[PDB]
């Protein structure tokens, strides 16, 4: 059981359609648990998973105060970065930040993360030592100097090693029936002729959690990496995930093909064939 917590912030300017929108979401592994949106009728931190709802008024207020302050801070940062890049006010831009902590399985701080981006390009990241910064360009160097002056890295290290980890463990215990439960994929193999001489074998995995899974096709026991059409893992909407992998095979050669699935929730790895 290897777990993580992450917060994802998106700050987006929109001239002249009002002030930049700030939205924060928090996740434990593949489960979202909180959101904040500066655009909501009444901006407040809101629960998005049942196990967080037991947190009391003081938690909710604490969160909301931080995200409100961040709303104002990010609007200034957007102004600053527009300045650093000599950009016009025209002119819509995005700052993103993702930070958090990884635990081992095991249960102690494996490593911490804090990364920011500007218009979808790396801008500034906290190094794995949690003590120094990697700035992408001369603009991000300005941010770096400001962040050094305010001793941000030191504050982050203290959070990533302390609170981040402590609260992740509390969430894992509170939501243990779901967060610490791996649901194995339900699997099957479909067959659809494409022409007289070729057919598609599709290996399906449904209903699994967490999202991490490996689906491969083999011909005579060797990987078919270039020939496998692999779909991005997708949410079912009920916390579970879906994925498939397809190969096009010469008709008559179907039995030479095997599908292999690895997922934490499985007693042991699966080997599947098309079963006529």
């Amino acid at each position: 059981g290897s777990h993580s917590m992450r917060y994802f912030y998106t700050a987006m300017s929109r001239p002249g359609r009002g002030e930049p929108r700030f939205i924060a979401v928090g996740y434990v592994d593949d489960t979202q648990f909180v959101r904040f949106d500066s655009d909501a009728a009444s901006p407040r931190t809101e629960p998005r998973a049942p196990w967080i709802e037991q947190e009391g008024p003081e938690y909710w207020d604490r969160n909301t105060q931080i995200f409100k302050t961040n709303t104002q801070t990010y609007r200034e940062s957007l102004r600053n970065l527009r300045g650093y890049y000599n950009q016009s006010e025209a002119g819509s831009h995005i700052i993103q930040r993702m930070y958090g902590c990884d635990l081992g399985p095991d249960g102690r701080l494996l490593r911490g993360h804090d990364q920011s981006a500007y218009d979808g390009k790396d801008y500034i990241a906290l190094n794995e030592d949690l003590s120094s910064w990697t700035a992408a360009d001369t603009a991000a160097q300005i941010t770096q100097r400001k962040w050094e002056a305010a001793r941000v890295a030191e504050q982050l290290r203290a959070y990533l090693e302390g609170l981040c980890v402590e609260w992740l463990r509390r969430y894992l215990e509170n939501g243990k029936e779901t967060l610490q439960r791996a649901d194995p994929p339900k699997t099957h193999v479909t067959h659809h002729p494409v022409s007289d001489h070729e057919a598609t074998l599709r290996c399906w995995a449904l209903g699994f959690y967490p999202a991490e899974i490996t689906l491969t096709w083999q011909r005579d026991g060797e990987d078919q990496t270039q020939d496998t059409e692999l779909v991005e893992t997708r949410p079912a909407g009920d916390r579970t995930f879906q994925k498939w992998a397809a190969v096009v095979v010469p008709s008559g050669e179907e039995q030479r093909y095997t599908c292999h699935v690895q997922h934490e929730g499985l007693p042991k790895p699966l080997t599947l064939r098309w079963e006529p």
């Binding site: 600053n80 609170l163 609260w167």
Partner: peptide, 9 residues
């Protein structure tokens, strides 16, 4: 719980 310090970039 989120990081409690905000700092302008």
């Amino acid at each position: 719980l989120p990081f409690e310090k905000s700092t302008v970039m």
